[PDB]
Amino acid sequence: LAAAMAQAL
């Protein structure tokens, strides 16, 4: 989740 969300930005 951490990486996935960071990717969005």
Method by which the model was determined: X-ray
Q: What is the 3-state secondary structure (H, E, C) of 1-9?
A: CHHHHHHHC
Longest dimension (CA), the chain: 13
Tokens of 1: 């989740």
In one-letter notation, the amino acid at residue 3 is A
Expressed in Å, this structure's resolution amounts to 0.8
Q: How far apart are CA 5 and CA 3, in angstroms?
A: 5
Rg of the chain over Cα atoms, rounded to whole angstroms, equals 5
